[PDB]
Amino acid sequence: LKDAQEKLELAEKKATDAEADVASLNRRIQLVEEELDRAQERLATALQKLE
Amino acid sequence: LGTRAKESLDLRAHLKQVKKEDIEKENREVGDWRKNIDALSGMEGRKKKFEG
């Protein structure tokens, strides 16, 4: 039980940590993708202007 | 002949003046505004409130 207790607590902490990491990284990837797309639209504007 | 030529010349002179010198009143409007970039610096917000 005590062994099971420690196993359970450690696994739960590891799981919550991984979840928080992946969620925040998902937010980051969203932000960087927004950067990319908005920059692409700037690229299209510039292309039209130059042509 | 010179009188007739100078009549038309003087008549067109004032029209040219009005057409051209008045352009100098303003020509900077061609200049565009800043249109600044963010450089991944304006990413300082979460999905907390969106209506405002």
Q: What is the DSSP string of B10-36?
A: HHHHHHHHHHHHGGGG--GGGS-----
Query: How close does chain B come to A3, measured CA to CA in Å?
Result: 39
Residue B23 near chain A (CB below 8 Å)? no
Cα–Cα–Cα angle for B46, A36, A50, nearest 5°?
A: 135
Choose from A25, A26, A34, A35 for mutation: most chain B CBs within 10 A: A35
Using DSSP's 3-state secondary structure scheme, residue B45 falls into: coil
- Tell me how the structure was determined: cryo-EM
The 3-class SS string of A36-50 reads HHHHHHHHHHHHHHH
Contact indicator for A35, B40 with CB cutoff of 8 Å = yes
* H or E segment and range at residue A16: helix A2-50
DSSP code of residue B50:
-
Tokens of A45: 């504007």
Contacts of B38 in chain A (CB under 8 A): 35
* Phi then psi dihedrals of residue B28, to 5 deg: -80, -10
